[PDB]
A paper describes a structure:
The [name] transporter system is composed of a periplasmic binding protein, [name], and a type I ABC-type importer consisting of a heterodimer of its transmembrane domain components, EppB and EppC, and a dimer of its nucleotide binding domain component, EppD. [name] binds free [name], but not metal–[name] complexes, restricting the ability of [name] [name] to use only weak metal–[name] complexes that can dissociate to free [name], making it imperative to determine the biophysical mechanism of [name]’s binding specificity before any improvements to its binding capabilities can be engineered. Based on its three-domain, bilobate structure, the β2β1β3βnβ4 configuration of the core β-sheet of Domain III, and the two-β-strand hinge, [name] is a Class II Cluster C periplasmic binding protein. In summary, [name]’s affinity for [name], EDDA, and EGTA, and its putative affinity for other APC chelators via molecular docking, suggests that it is a general binding protein for aminopolycarboxylates.
Soaking the crystals with [name] lowered their symmetry from P43212 to P212121, thereby doubling the molecules in the asymmetric unit to two; however, no [name] molecules could be placed unambiguously into the orthorhombic structure after refining the model with [name] in the ligand-binding cleft. Instead, two sulfate ions from the ammonium sulfate in the crystallization solution were present in the cleft of [name]. For both structures, all but the first four N-terminal residues (Gln27 through Leu30) of the mature protein (Gln27 through Glu563) were visible, and the C-terminal His-tag from pET30a(+) was visible through its first three His residues. Based on the relatively weak (e.g., no large, hydrophobic intermolecular interfaces) crystallographic and non-crystallographic protein–protein interactions in both the P43212 and P212121 crystal lattices, [name] is monomeric, which we confirmed by calculating a molecular mass of 63 kDa for the single chromatographic peak observed by analytical size-exclusion chromatography. Due to the high ammonium sulfate concentrations (1 to 2 M) in all of the conditions that [name] crystallized in, sulfate ions occupied [name]’s binding cleft, preventing formation of an [name]–[name] complex. When 100 mM [name] was added to the crystals, it caused the crystals to melt. To determine [name]’s [name]-binding mechanism, we resorted to molecular docking.
Residue numbers in the entry: 31 to 564
Write the structure that this text describes.
């Protein structure tokens, strides 16, 4: 029995001074997390200490208004939808220039798909629904007027950049695509600022002397040590080369090794991630273009065994995920996977599905209805995730009694970004869930969207997602979106499995360091990090 909640784990009041080194698994070649080329957890983690945010995702997966930056953020009308931000008078950039509506307006123009068509952004996330964005004479009152209703307005302006500096480095596209992306940032609107960068080796941050927030900074230096071999991170922690690691693919062996390092003052936190494993099926081309084969495969897979073999030996009460739009703890979640018989390990039912669609078995091999042998299936998965490798082997075994063979494919070319309608039949990977399921769903289930890898193509799903994204609460949104989850599971192109475990492994002298098991991650509150007093 503990008195810590997910939001208060490892709370304390640190001393002043010292340093913390946090391992990251990518070199920094793009400093702009909102750009397509900078959109990953490493850039997000390294720049969270310097980028101000309107709202921040908390460990309980809620959005918290940043009261260091903002006095208030209010939905003041719905006819038309209007949001008013009041920026704190004391909020300033590291050169002393006030943070103002100039910074909101610049970011909106880079993200809204209209004012800067050449900006190489990741995604608009609804910034394009803001039609006008105006500020008062003081620069501290910002009014956003929307062209249509939008649920996820608190996810907007989560990363702000210094407009007055960007303005000195070309037009909007040039400053966003070059200055803010390619250059090591000399500026900050957060508790820390970059002092030096050794490419491929080390980012060194120091306190921002003009930090305006309530807490911190406590450290003389905050360092991010680049260790691209994720399997060497626990050794670096053991050896004192870093003080914190956050590896992506935890295993039983990793947990057991970390537990054996308690004599060095190492502890760890692990929680269900916003990242969730799935198997996608190529509905656009190849054998999986037949929905009957997709449903037979999903019915034959034994999800209980999948989890029993790869999670249950070292993770207690680990939840199945039976939705492709909601995590198990989100409003609207239900086991829509099992309701359809997917994941039940029911080989005889799967064989019936195939027989009833015209498939036949000959000499141990499945024949398609025309009489041609079904090809060996290409099952790809990215490197660096031992659980995915193990599950790929297990799935091969589950479908072998159907007369299907598989070729397992991995390595650097087997990532999601490199998927093509021509190069896979089955793909094991993960998606990163967002605070607003309807916003995430619009990025992955719509016909002409990059992350629709498996070929959903249903105007009704798209209509439902649009209505859900226009709702006035997450709960209403979830009630609407549930219908799209049902239809998506009917199509059998995306099979949810279970959430990845996080693993924050660290020297316990560091206080106010806690897991934040979502895309924003543990560096959401570096202003509070410090070392306990001896």
């Amino acid at each position: 029995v503990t008195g810590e909640l997910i939001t208060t784990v490892n709370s304390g009041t640190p001393g002043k001074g010292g340093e913390v080194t946090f391992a990251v698994t990518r070199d920094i070649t793009n400093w702009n997390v909102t750009s397509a080329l900078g959109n990953n957890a490493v850039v997000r983690t390294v720049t969270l200490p310097i980028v101000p945010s309107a709202f921040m995702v908390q460990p309980d997966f809620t959005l918290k208004m940043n009261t260091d930056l903002l006095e208030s953020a209010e939905l003041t009308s719905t006819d038309p939808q209007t949001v008013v931000y009041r920026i704190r008078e004391d909020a300033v950039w590291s050169d002393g220039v006030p943070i103002t509506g100039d910074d909101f307006i610049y970011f909106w123009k880079t993200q809204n798909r209209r004012d800067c068509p050449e900006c190489l952004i990741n995604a608009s996330y609804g910034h394009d629904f803001i039609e006008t964005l105006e500020q008062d004479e003081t620069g501290k009152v910002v009014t956003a007027t929307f062209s249509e209703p939008f649920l996820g307005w608190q996810g907007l302006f989560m990363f702000l950049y210094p407009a007055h500096l960007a303005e000195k480095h070309g037009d909007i596209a040039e400053s966003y695509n070059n200055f803010l992306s390619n250059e090591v940032p000399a500026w900050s609107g957060g508790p820390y600022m970059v002092e030096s960068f050794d490419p491929g080796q080390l980012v060194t941050l120091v306190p921002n002397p003009k930090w305006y927030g309530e807490k911190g900074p406590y450290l003389d230096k905050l360092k991010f040590r680049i260790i691209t071999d994720s399997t060497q991170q626990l050794t670096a922690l053991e050896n004192g080369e870093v003080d914190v690691i956050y590896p992506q693919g935890a295993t039983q062996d990793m947990v057991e090794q970390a537990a054996g390092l308690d004599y060095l003052g190492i502890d760890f936190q692990m929680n269900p991630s916003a990242n969730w494993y799935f198997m996608g099926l190529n509905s656009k081309a190849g054998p999986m273009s037949d929905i009957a084969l997709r449903k037979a495969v999903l019915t034959a897979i034994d999800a209980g065994d999948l989890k029993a073999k790869t999670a249950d030996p070292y993770l207690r009460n680990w939840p199945h995920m039976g939705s492709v739009m909601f995590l198990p703890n989100q409003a609207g979640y239900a086991d829509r996977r099992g309701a359809r018989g997917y994941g039940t390990g029911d080989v005889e039912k799967a064989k019936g599905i195939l027989s009833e669609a015209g498939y036949k078995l000959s000499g141990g091999s499945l024949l398609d209805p025309s009489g041609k042998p079904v090809s060996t299936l290409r099952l790809s998965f990215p490197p660096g995730y031992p659980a995915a490798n193990d599950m790929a082997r297990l799935i091969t075994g589950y479908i072998a009694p159907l007369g299907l063979k598989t070729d397992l494919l991995t390595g650097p070319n087997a990532t999601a970004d490199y998927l093509l309608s021509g190069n896979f039949d089955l793909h094991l990977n993960y998606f990163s869930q967002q605070v607003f399921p309807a916003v995430k769903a619009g990025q992955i289930f719509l016909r002409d969207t990059r992350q629709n890898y498996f070929g959903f193509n249903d105007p009704k799903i798209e209509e439902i997602i649009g209505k859900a994204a226009a709702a006035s609460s997450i709960e209403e949104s979830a009630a609407i979106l549930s219908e799209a989850d049902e239809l998506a599971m009917d199509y059998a192109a995306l099979f949810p499995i279970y959430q990845l475990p996080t693993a924050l492994i660290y020297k316990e002298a560091i206080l106010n360091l806690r897991d934040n098991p979502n895309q924003l991650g543990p560096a959401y509150n570096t202003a509070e990090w410090g070392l306990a007093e001896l």
